[PDB]
Amino acid sequence: VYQIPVLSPSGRRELAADLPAEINPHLLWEVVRWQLAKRRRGTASTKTRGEVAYSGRKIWPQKHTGRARHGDIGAPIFVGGGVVFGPKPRDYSYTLPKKVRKKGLAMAVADRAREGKLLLVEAFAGVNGKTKEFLAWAKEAGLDGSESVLLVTGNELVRRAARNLPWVVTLAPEGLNVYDIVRTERLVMDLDAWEVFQNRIG
Amino acid sequence: PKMKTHKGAKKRVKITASGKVVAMKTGKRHLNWQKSGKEIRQKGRKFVLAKPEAERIKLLLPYE
Amino acid sequence: PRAKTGVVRRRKHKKILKLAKGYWGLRSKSFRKARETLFAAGNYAYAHRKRRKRDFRRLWIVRINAACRQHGLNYSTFIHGLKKAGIEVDRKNLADLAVREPQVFAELVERAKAAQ
Amino acid sequence: MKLSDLRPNPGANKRRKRVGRGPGSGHGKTATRGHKGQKSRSGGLKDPRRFEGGRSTTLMRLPKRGMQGQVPGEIKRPRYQGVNLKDLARFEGEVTPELLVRAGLLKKGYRLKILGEGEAKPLKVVAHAFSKSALEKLKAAGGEPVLLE
RNA sequence: GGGCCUGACUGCGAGGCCUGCAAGCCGAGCAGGGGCGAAAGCCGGGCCUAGUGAACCGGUGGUCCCGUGUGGAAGGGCCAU
RNA sequence: GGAUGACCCCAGGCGGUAGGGGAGCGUUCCCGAUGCCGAUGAAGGCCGACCCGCGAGGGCGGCUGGAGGUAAGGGAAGUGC
RNA sequence: GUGGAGCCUGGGAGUGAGGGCGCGAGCGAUAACGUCCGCGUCCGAGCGCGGGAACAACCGAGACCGCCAGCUAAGGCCCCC
RNA sequence: CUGUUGGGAAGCAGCGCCAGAGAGGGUGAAAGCCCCGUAGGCGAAAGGUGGGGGGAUAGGUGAGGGUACCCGAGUACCCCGUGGUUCGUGGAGCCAUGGGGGAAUCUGGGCGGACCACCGCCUAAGGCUAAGUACUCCGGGUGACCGAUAGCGCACCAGUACCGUGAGGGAAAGGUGAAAAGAACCCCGGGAGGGGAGUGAAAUAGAGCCUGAAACCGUGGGCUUACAAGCAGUCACGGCCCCGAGGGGUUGUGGCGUGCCUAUUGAAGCAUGAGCCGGCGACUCACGGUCGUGGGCGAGCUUAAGCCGUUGAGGCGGAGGCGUAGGGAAACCGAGUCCGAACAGGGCGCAGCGGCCGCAAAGUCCGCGGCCGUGGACCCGAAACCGGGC
RNA sequence: GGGGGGAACCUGGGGAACUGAAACAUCUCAGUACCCAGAGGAGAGGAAAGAGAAAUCGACUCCCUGAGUAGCGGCGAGCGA
Numbered sequence A: 001v002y003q004i005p006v007l008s009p010s011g012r013r014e015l016a017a018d019l020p021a022e023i024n025p026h027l028l029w030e031v032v033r034w035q036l037a038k039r040r041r042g043t044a045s046t047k048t049r050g051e052v053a054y055s056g057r058k059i060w061p062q063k064h065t066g067r068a069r070h071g072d073i074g075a076p077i078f079v080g081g082g083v084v085f086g087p088k089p090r091d092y093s094y095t096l097p098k099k100v101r102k103k104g105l106a107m108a109v110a111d112r113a114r115e116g117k118l119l120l121v122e123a124f125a126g127v128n129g130k131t132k133e134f135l136a137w138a139k140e141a142g143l144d145g146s147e148s149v150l151l152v153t154g155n156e157l158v159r160r161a162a163r164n165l166p167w168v169v170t171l172a173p174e175g176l177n178v179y180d181i182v183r184t185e186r187l188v189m190d191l192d193a194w195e196v197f198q199n200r201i202g
Numbered sequence B: 001p002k003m004k005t006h007k008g009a010k011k012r013v014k015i016t017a018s019g020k021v022v023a024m025k026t027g028k029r030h031l032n033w034q035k036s037g038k039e040i041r042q043k044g045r046k047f048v049l050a051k052p053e054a055e056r057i058k059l060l061l062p063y064e
Numbered sequence C: 001p002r003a004k005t006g007v008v009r010r011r012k013h014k015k016i017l018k019l020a021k022g023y024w025g026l027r028s029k030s031f032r033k034a035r036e037t038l039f040a041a042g043n044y045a046y047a048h049r050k051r052r053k054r055d056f057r058r059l060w061i062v063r064i065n066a067a068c069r070q071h072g073l074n075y076s077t078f079i080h081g082l083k084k085a086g087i088e089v090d091r092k093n094l095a096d097l098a099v100r101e102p103q104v105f106a107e108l109v110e111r112a113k114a115a116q
Numbered sequence D: 001m002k003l004s005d006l007r008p009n010p011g012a013n014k015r016r017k018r019v020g021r022g023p024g025s026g027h028g029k030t031a032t033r034g035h036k037g038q039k040s041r042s043g044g045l046k047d048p049r050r051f052e053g054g055r056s057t058t059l060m061r062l063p064k065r066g067m068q069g070q071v072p073g074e075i076k077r078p079r080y081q082g083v084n085l086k087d088l089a090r091f092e093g094e095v096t097p098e099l100l101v102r103a104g105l106l107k108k109g110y111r112l113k114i115l116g117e118g119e120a121k122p123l124k125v126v127a128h129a130f131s132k133s134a135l136e137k138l139k140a141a142g143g144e145p146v147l148l149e
Numbered sequence E: 001g002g003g004c005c006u007g008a009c010u011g012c013g014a015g016g017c018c019u020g021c022a023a024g025c026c027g028a029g030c031a032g033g034g035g036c037g038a039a040a041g042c043c044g045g046g047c048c049u050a051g052u053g054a055a056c057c058g059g060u061g062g063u064c065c066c067g068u069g070u071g072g073a074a075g076g077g078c079c080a081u
Numbered sequence F: 001g002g003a004u005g006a007c008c009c010c011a012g013g014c015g016g017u018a019g020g021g022g023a024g025c026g027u028u029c030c031c032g033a034u035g036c037c038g039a040u041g042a043a044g045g046c047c048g049a050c051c052c053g054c055g056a057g058g059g060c061g062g063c064u065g066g067a068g069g070u071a072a073g074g075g076a077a078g079u080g081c
Numbered sequence G: 001g002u003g004g005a006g007c008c009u010g011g012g013a014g015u016g017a018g019g020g021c022g023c024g025a026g027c028g029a030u031a032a033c034g035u036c037c038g039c040g041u042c043c044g045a046g047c048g049c050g051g052g053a054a055c056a057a058c059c060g061a062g063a064c065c066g067c068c069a070g071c072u073a074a075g076g077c078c079c080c081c
Numbered sequence H: 001c002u003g004u005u006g007g008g009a010a011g012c013a014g015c016g017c018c019a020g021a022g023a024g025g026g027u028g029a030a031a032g033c034c035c036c037g038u039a040g041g042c043g044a045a046a047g048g049u050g051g052g053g054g055g056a057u058a059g060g061u062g063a064g065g066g067u068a069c070c071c072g073a074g075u076a077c078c079c080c081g082u083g084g085u086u087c088g089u090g091g092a093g094c095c096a097u098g099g100g101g102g103a104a105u106c107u108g109g110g111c112g113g114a115c116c117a118c119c120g121c122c123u124a125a126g127g128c129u130a131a132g133u134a135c136u137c138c139g140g141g142u143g144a145c146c147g148a149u150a151g152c153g154c155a156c157c158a159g160u161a162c163c164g165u166g167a168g169g170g171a172a173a174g175g176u177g178a179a180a181a182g183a184a185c186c187c188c189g190g191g192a193g194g195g196g197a198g199u200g201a202a203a204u205a206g207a208g209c210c211u212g213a214a215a216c217c218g219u220g221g222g223c224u225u226a227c228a229a230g231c232a233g234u235c236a237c238g239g240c241c242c243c244g245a246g247g248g249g250u251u252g253u254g255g256c257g258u259g260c261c262u263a264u265u266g267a268a269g270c271a272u273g274a275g276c277c278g279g280c281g282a283c284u285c286a287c288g289g290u291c292g293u294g295g296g297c298g299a300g301c302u303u304a305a306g307c308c309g310u311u312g313a314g315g316c317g318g319a320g321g322c323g324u325a326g327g328g329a330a331a332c333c334g335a336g337u338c339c340g341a342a343c344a345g346g347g348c349g350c351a352g353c354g355g356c357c358g359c360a361a362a363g364u365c366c367g368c369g370g371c372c373g374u375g376g377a378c379c380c381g382a383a384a385c386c387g388g389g390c
Numbered sequence I: 001g002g003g004g005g006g007a008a009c010c011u012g013g014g015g016a017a018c019u020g021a022a023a024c025a026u027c028u029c030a031g032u033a034c035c036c037a038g039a040g041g042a043g044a045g046g047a048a049a050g051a052g053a054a055a056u057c058g059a060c061u062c063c064c065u066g067a068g069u070a071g072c073g074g075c076g077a078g079c080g081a
């Protein structure tokens, strides 16, 4: 139902593949929210009035001094006291449904396919590790760097060559994720990475 | 931490399939000699707790 | 993250103190006394723009009354005469006429005496 | 579609209720708590599900009934889960406890008992028990009741 | 006032009164086995409204429902008090 | 009405404590951002009789300041005295 | 009788110190700005507006905003007004 | 690299280049290529480590048949007093043992929740034993962590000053500038301080130094005020001053007018709190629950700890949980079941829109929101109680 | 060979109370706080006189789950394999 342009030495073929016809924006939103929440460090912390360094002594008598009543100086009403309901170390991760994740993956690739921004390649002609080599290959492939590109391939030498380009994000196929797809204006995958993708949304 | 089941409710009461709360009639534990057979008999049945009280008791049985 | 007060309260206080320019003593200098003064000020302005409509009608009526009594009738009989004559010039314009155009007001008095 | 287009559906992410933040909110000062009770205090009331202000509670005035058990506790005995004929309509050939556990019908650690809601089909069904009507239907439909032990 | 009697029933209970809850109250009718009456019928205590006490804990009679590997037993449950 | 929050027309409601509900403003931080605004001057400060907004606010202009700030759209809270 | 009517299910409450007045009673002394019920009302929450010299609850009247326009309500029309 | 504006280029402009390096921090402003780094690599004579590799050594090793010699003693075991366990005397077993009594060596003994029988499990009264687990004084890495009232009590000569006999208590206090170029010299002054000169892009950046709010205190100017009754304003008109059919400032007279908050039936109230200003200051979080809601899937839905990957990449993992059947104290039966003699009566149960595909739905998962339970649970506040010390 | 020290962590020997039960004594807080002895980079535990019903498993430790289940409980509050 989608016609996906392939890049071959023999020429621009066409591979067909069924991806979700319907894009559900809210669902992709839920996946990105999950991805961004689970990476949070959760390292904000404060000190309660029990965790603060001061003595528990009552600073002056309850009655007859003419001052307001007080207990110890760690109470949160004091400058330098403990803090009320401050943050504590916290785990923001949660288990988004696997079927939502997998469906989000497929929709994210579908969205690029429907825009014409998904390109598959058999091989990276002569890119062997050097950024200049990938730049030449990119130009011939139509990747002039005017659009950000998510490059998914299991070829290490291709990833090492592209990764320092400001407009390229590089992933191995087992790391395809919808936040990285939506981050970038174009999707560029190995036929090998494509099959890993197809195995995962199956 | 997770709620604990209230065991006094669990020993007195049942939640039915449709979420009613059923208990035993009171009043025949003792002092029965002069109670009519009608009173003894009808006190041998279960009854449905009034809605306000049934809602509270069901909150005490979070895992039934 | 922490969100300390920062600039927010200073700016709210300056809005209020600016509205209170001209007030006496701390009523223009203290944020607290200025706010209290403005509470009253806002109620007064509301109450007084209602009241201004009555203040002016009272003034018109008094001036109309004196104009009438130069022609030998009082305000109440004058107004009744205008109602029977079907004349609907309001009290704001009648009082202007009584001062700025005495020949027209004299005519209006005529119509009113004659309408009874 | 790009990052600035990612949006929750309307109503998906609602704002919270923030009390004690000024007169305009509707929730200032007393913070929707009213004036001056035990319920207004930090710490609040006794458990509203049970406590009734000192009188003997609704629950405690009701009588206990039944066996509640004793130490050393629950007597191990074989337990049965019933599975209706209707739930067997998707199987072909032979159905057995392990198959119904896999399909999400029977729970592990439960002997299988077939029950008679629905219609039988000609299947060889292996189980630890059968309702009287489930035997009747399964025989009439050409099935093979195989009783286990 | 007299005769014969034990319905001062067992298993239930349509429908209501009252009512915050829990209680309290009235109840035709069906079945079992009866009492009185020739019968129609009446009888599930008392002309009526007070004579009373929720749970928990325990006793007694029955039931034979549970019985910690098994058969028993201990100890419980249920019905009645 | 027109088809849908496109704007219009007609009609009606619109005092308010405890309290229920709705819609917004602003503060700190994250994505947006290897971007973009910035010494031809960031943030903050001091003015304004100007503009927008019912309002909380947001612009714009002059002065100060001298190096940071951060959009549409979303996310999270040590969020408004 | 189409009303910010009613009924059903469910989420969230707050309130469980009332007070004046009119009428009907009890208590009190055919006392209390007294006290305790009933029907109603207002204040509470309308200490917003007119009248009552001033004054929560007496009379008039239910304040969405603006007007240097008009009609009335109670109460007033010798001067303060 | 060059030009250009600027005190200064890294900004803007022209033409280039590197990249397994475009993480980040500096440099006079905003730099991939100036500097320190980063990617990728390299490195120990000496001391420490060495759970990995190699090598030693210690130690490890049969079958019948007979014999009945040994197999952990004040022990088992029973009773009494207790502890441990979910078990609070309970039908109270098990494990431990302070007191009393007190065995046996496999045909011995302990256990399977009183006890007895049967059937099984196990070998007490000697000792040792890596790893998986806990913690963070110490080192490093990383933050939808703080940014000088915050963050540790301490960014600074802080467990200091100071308080206390003592245990013990316990602060405040960061910033010139790009560079000290930290102002020679002259002038008034005893000095302090200042005025010139001079430095600087800038000196109300001059060391009592970035920015420099507010209360509070002055100097100058406009309007105004000594016959006037006031919660201090507000409405109106007029005068004067200012900026140019308008507006800003001021206020003479006239009208009206009982501060704010709290608590109350009721407060301007002669009821509470507040001298004023600035800053800190109170409804949260985890887990569970119950509704509502945005999505996923649907007779199913979903994983947990982990494991693999990544180094802000996700995947695997079905153990388990909820749901798919209820009724009954239970045996048990089951779209029924319980009470009952009942085939009676009653209680509790039981049940899609469309032209096969849609849809819509049990239910369940995740996000979000309200409220509930457990925790200090909105914040501050006792008098007290207890432990260990002084 | 020992002695003394070490932020927490660990084991053993002793061991509270406020509080909760809307009073309080059993019960709770809790074998927690704290005192003490000892240990080490860990400590404890550990190779069945085990479990408990599987004709079964096979040291110990630690995580998930079983499960707020079984049960315990002035059968209260709660406690909890």
Ligand SMILES: NC(=[NH2+])NCCC[C@H](N)C(=O)O
Residues within 6 Å of the ligand: A159, A163, A164, A170, A171, A172
């Ligand atoms: N092939 C990969 N796994 N690439 C990950 C990218 C790592 C790093 N963030 C970079 O941009 O270079």
Ligand SMILES: [Mg+2]
Residues within 6 Å of the ligand: A040, A041, A042, A043, H144
């Ligand atoms: Mg975080």
Ligand SMILES: [Mg+2]
Residues within 6 Å of the ligand: A041, A042, A043, A044, A087, A088, A089, A090
């Ligand atoms: Mg955090």
Ligand SMILES: [Mg+2]
Residues within 6 Å of the ligand: A045, A046, A047
């Ligand atoms: Mg902290």
Ligand SMILES: [Mg+2]
Residues within 6 Å of the ligand: A045, A046, A047, A048, A082, A083, A086
């Ligand atoms: Mg803190």
Ligand SMILES: [Mg+2]
Residues within 6 Å of the ligand: A049, A050, A056, A072, A074, A075
């Ligand atoms: Mg404290």
Ligand SMILES: [Mg+2]
Residues within 6 Å of the ligand: A049, A050, A051, A054, A055, A056, A074
């Ligand atoms: Mg403390």
Ligand SMILES: [Mg+2]
Residues within 6 Å of the ligand: A050, A051, A052, A053, A054, A055, A056
């Ligand atoms: Mg402390």
Ligand SMILES: [Mg+2]
Residues within 6 Å of the ligand: A053, A054, A055
């Ligand atoms: Mg200290």
Ligand SMILES: [Mg+2]
Residues within 6 Å of the ligand: A053, A054, A055, A056
């Ligand atoms: Mg301390």
Ligand SMILES: [Mg+2]
Residues within 6 Å of the ligand: A055, A056, A057
């Ligand atoms: Mg203390």
Ligand SMILES: [Mg+2]
Residues within 6 Å of the ligand: A056, A057, A058, A071, A072
């Ligand atoms: Mg204290």
Ligand SMILES: [Mg+2]
Residues within 6 Å of the ligand: A055, A056, A057, A058
């Ligand atoms: Mg102390």
Ligand SMILES: [Mg+2]
Residues within 6 Å of the ligand: A056, A057
């Ligand atoms: Mg103390």
Ligand SMILES: [Mg+2]
Residues within 6 Å of the ligand: A062, A063, A064
């Ligand atoms: Mg005092």
Ligand SMILES: [Mg+2]
Residues within 6 Å of the ligand: A066
């Ligand atoms: Mg004082």
